[PDB]
Amino acid sequence: VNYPKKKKMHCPDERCNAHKSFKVVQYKAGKARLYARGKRRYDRKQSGYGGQTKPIFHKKAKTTKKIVLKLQCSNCKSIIQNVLKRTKHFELNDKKKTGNKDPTW
Amino acid sequence: VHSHGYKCGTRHLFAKKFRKHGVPSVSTILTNFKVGDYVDVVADAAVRAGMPHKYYHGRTGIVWNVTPRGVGVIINKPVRNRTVRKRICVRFEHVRKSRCQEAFKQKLKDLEAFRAAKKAGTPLPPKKVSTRNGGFVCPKKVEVLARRTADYEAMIPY
RNA sequence: GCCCGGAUAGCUCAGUCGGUAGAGCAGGGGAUUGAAAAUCCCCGUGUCCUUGGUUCGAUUCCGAGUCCGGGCA
RNA sequence: GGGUACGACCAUACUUGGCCGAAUGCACCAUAUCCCGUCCGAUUUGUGAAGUUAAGCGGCCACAGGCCUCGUUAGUACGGCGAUCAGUGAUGGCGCUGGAACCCGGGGUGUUGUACUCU
RNA sequence: GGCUGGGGCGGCAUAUCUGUUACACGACAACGCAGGUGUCCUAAGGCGAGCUCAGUGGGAACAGAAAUCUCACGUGGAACACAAGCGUAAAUGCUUGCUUGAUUAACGAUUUCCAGUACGAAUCGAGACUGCGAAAGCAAGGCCAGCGAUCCUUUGCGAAGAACAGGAAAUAUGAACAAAUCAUACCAGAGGUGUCAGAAUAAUUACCACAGGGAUAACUGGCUUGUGGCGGCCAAGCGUUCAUAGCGACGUCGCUUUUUGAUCCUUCGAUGUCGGCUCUUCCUAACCUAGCGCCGCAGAAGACGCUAAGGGUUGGAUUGUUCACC
RNA sequence: CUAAGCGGGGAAAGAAGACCCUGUUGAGUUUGACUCCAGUCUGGCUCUGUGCGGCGACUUUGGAGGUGUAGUAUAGGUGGAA
RNA sequence: AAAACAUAGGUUUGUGAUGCAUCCAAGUGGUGUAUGUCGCAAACUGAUUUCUGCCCAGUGCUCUGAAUGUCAACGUGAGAGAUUCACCGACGCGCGGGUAAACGGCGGGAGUAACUAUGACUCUCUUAAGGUAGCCAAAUGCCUCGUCUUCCAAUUAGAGACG
RNA sequence: AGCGAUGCUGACGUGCAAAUCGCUCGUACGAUUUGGGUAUCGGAGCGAAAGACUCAUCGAACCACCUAGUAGCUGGUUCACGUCGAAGUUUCCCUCAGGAUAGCUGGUGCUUGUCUUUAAGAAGUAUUGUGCGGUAAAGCAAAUGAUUAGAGGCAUUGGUGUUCUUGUAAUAUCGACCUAUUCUCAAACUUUAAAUGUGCAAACAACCCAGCCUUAGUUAUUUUAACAAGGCUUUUGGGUACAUAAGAAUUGAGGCACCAAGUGGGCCUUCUUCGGUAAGCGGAGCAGGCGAUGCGGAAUGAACCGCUUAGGGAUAUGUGG
RNA sequence: ACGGACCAAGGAGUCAAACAGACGCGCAAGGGAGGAGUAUGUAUGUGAGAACUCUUUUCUCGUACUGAAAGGGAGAGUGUGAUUUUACACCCGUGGCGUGCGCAAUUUCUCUUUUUUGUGUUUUUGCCCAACGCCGGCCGGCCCCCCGUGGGCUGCGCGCG
RNA sequence: CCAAGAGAGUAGCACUGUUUGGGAAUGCAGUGUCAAGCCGGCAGGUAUUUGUCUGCCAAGGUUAAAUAUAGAGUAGGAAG
């Protein structure tokens, strides 16, 4: 696709409820942690003398992953996520479509 | 076994038919409601919202609700050994008042009005006849029947 | 998932103890060679991928989504 | 009754061609300073006066067209009913119940509210 | 894995969407018919205004059929991101104009599929906050497919204030208490399942194991009779003459079951696989024999048919054979 | 009613079909299965002295220790500084 | 009970003792080996005879090869602290090289005579290499009773050719 | 001699025999027989290797043990009478010979109660009244989609030709094209459009009349607004009842519930209908059966006919003679 | 299709937790001890797991729930005033149903009885429904934000032990 | 006139494993590593530092009785 980058949208925040300007951005993941509780546990099972003890998952069945936008309304100390359709293509860069009345050929 | 949209289509039903195309009338909109109305359900098409699934056109239910654009109808839907009441969220455009009931009541009051009049209002006032009967007859010219083939050369297939 | 060559000209590669843009070389003419063979001189040409950065000046000098090629998980 | 206008209904209101039109009015029609708006005053904006009913408009007309509408078709067709019965097989078959489309005929050809006007 | 007219294979009928099957409600199977889905799209979203197609004609340098230009028609026959289907025309289309509602929610209420679970997907309000517009109004990303549990991770969730004694009466814990990390929370998201309610999984066995199943293949037998195998009918032609001596095309019905297929009834706690030898008997669609009819039978010879199954009906060679074949 | 026969049948017996299929039933065997493991290797550390001798690590005087163009001029340059 | 194996005969590796090979719960354990390349170990091939082609791309193996990709612990220095990171960093692997009596492999494409068929002849793509020597309807050929010659009255037989 | 086992598919094949026997045969100076002594053993050995053989044990030896190991499966599965009485179906499943679930079932209930039914509530049904489709049918001259011939034009050389060069000629010319005509047709065509079905409605918890109550219902103005909306309303507050004059029947109760089983392979049929030639074939739709019942009928039959069943008796019928 | 030559004697649905219903059974907001322990003769014995018990302490489960929590928490009685922080009063929350109870007409009966009729009325603990209300809960509403008249979503809660 | 005489390669820590309901560790075992100004040491069930506060004082050393007997126990009763 392509979508914006900055965006005048609603922030309900306590530095107001209003439609405000936001910078828009697109997520990436804050993925996992050593010492994390899960991990501590995962690790606990993992210990010792066994073989391997889990599902490893191998189906893949599409390719899409819900894009999330991270929107920061300025004033607001507020960041928000906002989710998109499954896509194979994406883009935020605030550029715009143009209407095709001139084909070079 | 078959494919299933909740708006899965048909051949010749939903399609908006014989010169019957296009938006609902303003008369449609001028209508007015109250609740508890027994109104029947139909599908425009128009907007593909507030639009029931298949069950429902040709069925009469009762409104329980009036919302901005729309009305709530509870309908009894027959499942297994029962009919369950289903309350459906239509915008107003897809439903209408019958006559189903209208008559019954209409008559009932009208009649009462008369029954009451007849005692206990002023007047008194013939209506109808009984059912069906016998009779004297002075007819004046019986016929019979002679069918097919005479002058069949005038007619029949080739 | 880290390790990284390659993102520049056809293909492939730089910038005083703060100046800025490369050859090769396909290429395209010449010239050389009676014409050839053998050979020489000259063409052309990059966002220095993709975007950010210190500063009167900054592809010099710099940051990074990326792209991509390969190693162990 | 027409007009006007707002209609509501949304084809007896419709395509097509004639003929004709008092009034009120509609209309066409001029204009473009203003405002307005357009390559363009064609539209639209703005002004609206001269014209002109030619068109529109209206109404009618019409072996017009269309529709409308009824009849006609046809209890056929076609369904429903059967233990039954004939049938190479479909069928066909009875009596019990229902019930056509086309066709042709016939006729029909907008309805009518609200506010305004116009003797 | 499953699937499955056996298994295998292939195919995917496994989550699915469409249209059709399917009896004018509703619901309905097949590895039926005909199609689709894993994305796409910051507008292809959203709103206004404007604008109107598919298509046809007539003209207009170049330019001719096909350029544009232009009149002029023209119920969409188009066109509408897409499969398919729906719809639909001063719009839903289409073009422009503007935008961010594809937004945010106590988010209840609601529907569909339906277990009256679920998700998924939809529907209806209310609150926001925007947008758009003259205004009503619309606007929660065309409508319908295009999508994902538990489990886990992760991303996002008050600062700011007012404390006496909670000062909205001030987001939770980390259990002897502090202060600080760190870690846990509550909550809503994302992260993936297509065998699509959602196990981390290669072979091989004719060395084989086991339990069953005739719920299932592999013989007979059983239906059928496509397929084969046999006869008509018909009769265009043929056949020097010549429809029919004898034929028999084109057709077109028969008929059979020593074919072959199909079907899985039965049979798996058992009905001893080939062939052949032997040996009987039987059947007739009679090859030979008895005797009739025809002849495109002069004789000759054959041919055709009837009536006839009482009677007869071979040795080798080669080849497991069968069949084949000298 | 039988003797001696007799081997058609009694789908004889004969042996809970070994084929065949199925079974969230098995194995023998196979392999780049999944998933370990014996094993093999490598490193790391260690036992570990004794020397004499190199490189490292120390910060100690700050020395060898810094010129583009145009300022005939010293160019990371900072600053109490007239 | 053989066409099987053994078998002499053929061929290569691995390997010289603080070793190789190899057994083992472990030990100053075992065996080859009370022994030393005319040695041992290890596999393959299967008298004599005669020959043994091409391919190392693949896949192994091998390499003393390269050297700075990678590759664990391991260290090493870095923040209240945890805690973090960075650099360090091994064989191996990347990598580079060798190798076929290792595993195995060893092509496809056209045209071409004026008599003739025929296509030596000559062009093509392409592989690691494109199957050489040989040898066949052969226990090997699917077509297939392939063909012919030959033998039998007659031969899906045989044999000889053909291959 | 011996040691072995080739052929007779010899003998036997409930044998003298858990591998015997006859003949037959391999070899029989060597990698030659054998005795005793000694050694290797189970996921081990051994093995001139057959996965042989390893004490009638062997592609994992035998003992005892864990163990009664595990079973979506085979089999079995031990008195009477009465009363009631199925399913082959629902969804999900690494799910198809199985569950769960639902449904069907039994049992256990619980509040009332119909003879006043014109005011019980119910009814697999009619009636009205009241809703409603695109099968069958129709149809193609309507569209959509299909298809056959002429007739009547236009022509902008379709082709032909003569007169004409030859003609963007004429004239013939036959075609194209036009047009009205015209045949024959559709599962995913279709106006119209059935029958057969399918929703609803048919009462008192009603009707009216008052006049009330109340409302941060209706960008508000109540107000002697309107409407809305609901709430009321002693003796209805107050009034008001099922005739038609004309159009049901029923209703051997209704309401209502608790909870557990047994079932998930079906099969047969009228009817509709799919696949394929077909098939006692396959595969669906409806109803009914069978299954899970016998009796009576069809010389014979799961499902056809008739009909179902206490035990009898007496009578008459059923189908059928 | 399988199994089934014969006859005796064998030979297969058990014990058992929490738990759901059903039923009897106890008592009832308590109930069930419960572990134990004591305890005195019948006289073997005895100062009775089992006899009799018998029981102070109670124990244990039960007689409000809600929240992860931190944590709170029910006549938000009713009613009442109520500008209901409160403050008062103190023998049914709101409606729909209700075996019932009442009234009248209705038959006879002296009267009674009183058949029969006609109605009334009454707590939603008689059942259920239907709506507040109520606890914890959550959004904190209304509003531009926040607070108060007052909200307004929600739950194994509460509504006359 | 004061003293004031309490357990080490153990404790601990890493690491590994094993083991535990015990959770960022219930133990143990191996291996390595490896403690006490004594304002100490140990414990105080979310890692840490950090600080208090709370409970003990390990790492040598002995100890009826009330319990068992569980399948194969032996002397002598009581039984169902």
From TrEMBL, chain A:
Xref: PROSITE patterns: RIBOSOMAL_L44E
Biological process according to GO: cytoplasmic translation; translation
One Pfam family, short name: Ribosomal_L44
Protein name: 60S ribosomal protein L44
PANTHER family: 60S RIBOSOMAL PROTEIN L36A/L44
Molecular function terms from GO: structural constituent of ribosome
UniProt organism field: Trypanosoma brucei brucei (strain 927/4 GUTat10.1)
InterPro entries: Ribosomal_eL44, Ribosomal_LSU_eL42, Ribosomal_zn-bd
SUPFAM superfamilies: Zn-binding ribosomal proteins (SSF57829)
Keywords, in A-Z order: Ribonucleoprotein, Ribosomal protein
From TrEMBL, chain B:
SUPFAM superfamilies, alphabetized: Translation proteins SH3-like domain (SSF50104)
PROSITE patterns: RIBOSOMAL_L21E (PS01171)
Pfam families found in the cross-reference section: Ribosomal_L21e
PANTHER family named in the record: 60S RIBOSOMAL PROTEIN L21 (PTHR20981)
Top-rank taxon, per record: Eukaryota
Gene3D superfamilies in alphabetical order: Ribosomal protein L21
Annotated keywords: Metal-binding, Ribonucleoprotein, Ribosomal protein
Family recorded in the similarity comment: Belongs to the eukaryotic ribosomal protein eL21 family.
Name this polypeptide is given: 60S ribosomal protein L21E, putative
